[PDB]
């Protein structure tokens, strides 16, 4: 389509509205109520442009550009006098009640309303009457509420209710007294409530965790990074000030997370700022602890390692690819062990084998929203892979989108689309041990043990393809539900099968692979998604290595007298008694970590590693995309005593000091080249980001905004002499504002969005090819593997049905978005949000034990008799007890395990 704007010809998409077409062309139209992810509603009336039918038309008519299609032959004027006056009048009307709050408002300098007030040129107040006011609500620990600043743009309710399917936010009242919030005080229950702070164009909804230590956006040092709290790999922009991680903003990745994070990623960063973190290497001598610098630590550790007969390494899925590889080079390939348990490793390598050998395409997170039917097997996605649950909700809304497209309704007219669809949606079938948060939109929910969920999957695969192995002993009611699922999946043009390692059973993954294979054999465009546990679970699985049990028995037999543990607490993947005994038997334990873990009470050496905010590296997400995260700040800029290095830097220098008696701190690209030379399956991590020599016209990429303040005062209490800005030899970013952050710069890694006149998160418009699309020079990250030409065979290992047996309780995993991830549960803001510890019981089993709701029961697992209050679970199948995985004392390796001597005590 060809449009004319102010006498200039432009080529646009005719299926787009005029506002998104003109913003994609770089033109400036002020707007409030429209969002790229939410569609157009025409509420705020800010986006007015004058429209003409012909070129020889001079009268024109003001229209909403967000509500007007960008068809062929339209003439519009943005800079028309009447349009400019009306847009200024809309800003002035919004200003009549707006509080005088900018100095004490957390949105200031990041506020879309400030930007549009300036953009329209409204700076003179002539309204002289009173401003309306509102009381605020308590919305929980994450979101602060200030309704005085509301402009009634309806973005919050549209996002929260229509997009995120939340139920506890709404709009109340009437004419000029419209109120946006909850029906009463309480915590916002959506797992994606944190996106309101960027969705709201004012300071009504603000980040309370950032508000505790608030700084303005210009004072922030940003870097492009990857969220470390699960395996999805959402792109984040962490920002720091005065040596502490202040905020996590969404970094737009049009392929992965686009505009949205989940609340675990947004608010679970507080472990970075814990005061008990190791900042220096510490060596234990008897009961004394001596702080070493980097060289003495390397020399002493290398001497003890040279004296040792066998050194083994225990990696972790928390650590990056480079750190795990550096440990593997330090100890040797045959002496390297992944830090996860044997069953966890078996499930992870099976998921990897399905992904890169099953012949079925694995979609990126944005691509999930385009699928026509979803079957989730075993994986409680909202608690383990939350952004996948948000994307699945969008895929479910696809049916209303299709019905509206059949009636020639434009895809941005979201209200008409929702009116046409009503309650119709694409089929979603979820299986879990209990109810899920997806059950409100699920066509069916199967609450069953993991063996029974696997058997349901095997039956679905057999009914789709008779060559798949059959399962006998299916009830006619379950058979009818199976035929419902089969008729839904067979009629889908794009079916999606989601599973993962979190269900704790190999057979659930095998059944999901069988269903995907059966759908592929019918010639369907089937996708498969596997949800891993940690940020670099897939990278550790690709790298491989022995299980934690093998490392523990090597230490226990005495064959290994030195162990180097990298970023692993070892209690999440094995019994703490066995781990403590094995680590006490070893004469040398070295722990390279950034968090104060329990295994440093027996560590002879503790290397203060960097967290993700102080390190660079590569992580592999659940769909096999290698993504580079960059260091945010130098921790030694303020505290010169801080010796906190990247884990791969520590281990590379340790290997160098062990071999040639000399210290080599190396560079990141050298380690990356070593990875891609030694491990060919990880060869794609070279292209995840350009190397440290990359420039934009000779200049590096800036980590902080050009108006970054306080350079000659922020360290002045320590010393009046300003030091050099810390140097970044590892990456293409500079630790200063003396660099490039132009929206037209040819790069993919954008540390933060800012454009002149656009200080808010709406500045991401200028960094995209089209608004709501891709970053204009490609999204960062690269897939490690393609879809294989040939698939796998059917897994014939159909399990028998679950049988309750007396005195033996099967542990059903219950994951929590706040609590089940180790580092984010260490954050202090998550303690209020985390549930109280509990044990779930069936009503029949609780009646058999003579136990009511709330009473404490004691059970023993591996010599640990722990007590827990009882919560009654209606949906949990009898013969099981529900346990919160990943909490204090409940390791996720307990998923699928058994229990003895469960009695009331």
């Amino acid at each position: 389509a060809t449009i004319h704007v102010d006498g200039k010809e432009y080529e646009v998409n005719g299926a787009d509205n005029l506002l998104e077409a003109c913003l994609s062309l770089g033109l400036d139209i002020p707007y409030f109520c429209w969002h790229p992810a939410l569609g157009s509603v025409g509420a705020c009336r800010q986006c007015a442009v004058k429209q003409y039918q012909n070129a020889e038309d001079t009268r024109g008519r003001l229209v909403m550009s967000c509500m007007t299609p960008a068809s062929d032959g339209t003439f519009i004027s943005i800079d028309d006098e009447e349009a400019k006056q009306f847009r200024e009048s809309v800003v002035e009307w919004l200003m009549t009640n707006h509080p005088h709050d900018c100095p004490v408002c957390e949105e200031g300098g990041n506020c879309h309303l400030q930007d549009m007030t300036v953009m329209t040129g409204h700076s003179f107040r002539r309204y002289r009457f009173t401003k309306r006011t509102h009381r605020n609500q308590d919305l929980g620990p994450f979101i602060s509420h200030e309704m005085n600043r509301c402009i009634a743009c309806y973005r919050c309710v549209r996002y929260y209710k229509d997009y995120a399917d939340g139920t506890d936010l709404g709009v109340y009242g009437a004419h000029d007294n419209v109120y946006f919030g909850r029906p009463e005080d309480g915590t916002l229950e959506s797992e994606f409530s944190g996106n309101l702070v960027e969705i709201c164009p004012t300071g009504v909804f603000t980040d309370k965790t950032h508000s505790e230590r608030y700084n303005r956006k210009w004072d922030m040092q940003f870097a492009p990074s990857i969220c470390q709290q699960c395996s999805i790999g959402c792109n984040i922009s962490p920002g720091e000030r005065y040596g502490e991680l202040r905020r996590i903003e969404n970094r737009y990745n049009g392929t992965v997370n686009h505009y949205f994070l989940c609340d675990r990623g947004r608010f679970g960063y507080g472990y970075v700022n814990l005061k008990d973190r190791p900042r220096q290497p510490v060596q234990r001598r008897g009961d004394d602890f001596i702080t070493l610098n980097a060289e003495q630590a390397m020399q002493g550790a290398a001497d003890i390692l040279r004296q040792s007969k066998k050194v083994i390494g225990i990696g972790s899925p928390r650590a990056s690819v480079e750190s795990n590889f550096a440990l593997r080079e330090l100890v040797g390939e045959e002496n390297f062990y992944t830090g996860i348990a044997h069953g966890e490793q078996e499930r992870l390598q099976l998921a990897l084998k399905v992904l890169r050998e099953g012949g079925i395409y694995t979609p990126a997170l944005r691509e999930i929203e385009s699928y026509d039917a979803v079957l989730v097997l075993g994986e409680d996605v909202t608690q383990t892979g939350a952004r996948v649950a948000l994307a699945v909700r969008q895929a479910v809304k696809g049916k209303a989108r299709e019905m509206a497209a059949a009636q020639k309704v434009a895809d941005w007219q979201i209200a008409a689309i929702l009116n046409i669809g009503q309650r119709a949606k694409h089929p979603l079938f979820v299986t879990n041990v209990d109810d899920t948060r997806l059950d409100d939109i699920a066509a069916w929910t199967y609450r069953a043990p993991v063996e029974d969920q696997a058997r349901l999957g095997f039956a679905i695969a057999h009914a789709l393809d008779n060559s798949a192995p059959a399962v006998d002993g299916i009830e006619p009611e379950l058979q009818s539900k199976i035929d419902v699922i089969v008729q839904a999946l067979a009629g889908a043009k794009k079916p999606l099968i989601i599973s993962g390692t979190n269900a704790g059973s190999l057979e659930v993954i095998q059944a999901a692979a069988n269903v995907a294979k059966a759908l592929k054999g019918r010639g369907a465009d089937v996708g498969i998604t596997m949800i891993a546990r940690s940020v670099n679970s897939m990278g550790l699985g690709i790298m491989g290595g022995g299980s934690l049990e093998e490392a523990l028995t090597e230490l226990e037999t005495g064959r290994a007298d030195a162990v180097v543990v990298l970023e692993n607490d070892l209690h999440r993947h094995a019994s703490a008694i066995r781990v403590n005994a094995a680590l006490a038997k070893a004469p040398l334990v070295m722990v390279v970590d950034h968090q104060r873990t329990a295994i440093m009470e027996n560590a002879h050496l503790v290397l203060s590693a960097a967290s993700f905010a102080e390190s660079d590296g590569t992580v592999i997400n659940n769909e096999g995309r290698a993504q580079r995260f960059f260091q945010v700040y130098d921790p030694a800029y303020y505290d010169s005593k801080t010796v906190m290095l990247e884990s791969w830097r520590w281990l590379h220098s340790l290997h160098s000091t062990l071999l040639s008696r000399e210290v080599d701190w190396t560079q990141l690209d050298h380690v990356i080249d070593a990875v891609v030379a030694k491990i060919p399956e990880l060869a794609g991590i070279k292209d995840a980001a350009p190397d440290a020599t990359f420039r934009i016209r000779g200049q590096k990429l800036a980590r902080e905004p050009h108006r970054y303040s306080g350079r000659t005062a922020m360290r002045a209490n320590i010393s009046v002499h300003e030091p050099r800005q810390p140097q970044d030899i590892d990456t293409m970013f500079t630790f200063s504002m003396e660099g490039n952050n132009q929206p037209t710069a040819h790069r993919s890694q954008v540390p933060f969005a800012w454009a002149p006149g656009w200080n808010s998160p709406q500045a991401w418009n200028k960094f995209q090819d089209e608004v709501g699309g891709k970053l204009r020079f490609g999204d960062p990250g690269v897939r490690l593997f393609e879809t294989s030409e040939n698939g796998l065979d059917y897994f014939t290992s159909v399990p028998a049905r679950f049988q309750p047996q007396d005195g033996k309780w099967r542990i059903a995993p219950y994951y929590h978005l706040f609590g089940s991830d180790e580092l984010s549960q260490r954050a202090p803001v998550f303690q209020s949000r985390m549930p109280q510890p509990y044990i779930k019981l069936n009503p029949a089993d609780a009646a058999k034990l003579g136990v009511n709701a709330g009473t404490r029961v004691s059970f023993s697992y591996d010599g640990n008799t722990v007590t827990l209050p009882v919560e009654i679970a209606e949906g949990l199948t009898a013969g099981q007890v529900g346990l919160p995985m990943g909490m204090s004392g409940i390791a996720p390796v307990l998923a699928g395990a058994h229990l003895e001597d469960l009695k009331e005590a």
């Binding site: 506890d168 709404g170 009242g173 909850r182 029906p183 009463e184 009503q422």
Partner: protein, 156 residues
Amino acid sequence: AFELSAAEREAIEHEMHHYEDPRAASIEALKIVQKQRGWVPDGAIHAIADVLGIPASDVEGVATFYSQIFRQPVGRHVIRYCDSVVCHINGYQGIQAALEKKLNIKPGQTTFDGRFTLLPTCCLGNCDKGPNMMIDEDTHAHLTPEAIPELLERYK
């Protein structure tokens, strides 16, 4: 602690039968609770939402949108005097002054014995017979300030 009575619940379900979506019975469910109890208390929002299967935020948005759904306690009789343009021409201000003098309250307030709640309302669709006002279900036309104390006395 709010509990819907059997009559309220049966009336709400019978109104749920009238539409193809149970959400369409939200306004009349609020009206049923208001008719039984004078107004809609806070727990009634969650009870009605649970019956209709829609969120409590939607029910409260409906209840606070519509002016005749009372989310604050009112008196035994709600006086609704029209303050629109034809009754303004016909002199509703004298009627409002007479009501304020007799009841010793302001609009939007309730008398201290809980008998009357005085409220302005939009045009009652009786403009040829103005000025008009509405006690609970009865409309009174051709009002004069002298007839106000007598006509208020028949609502106990």
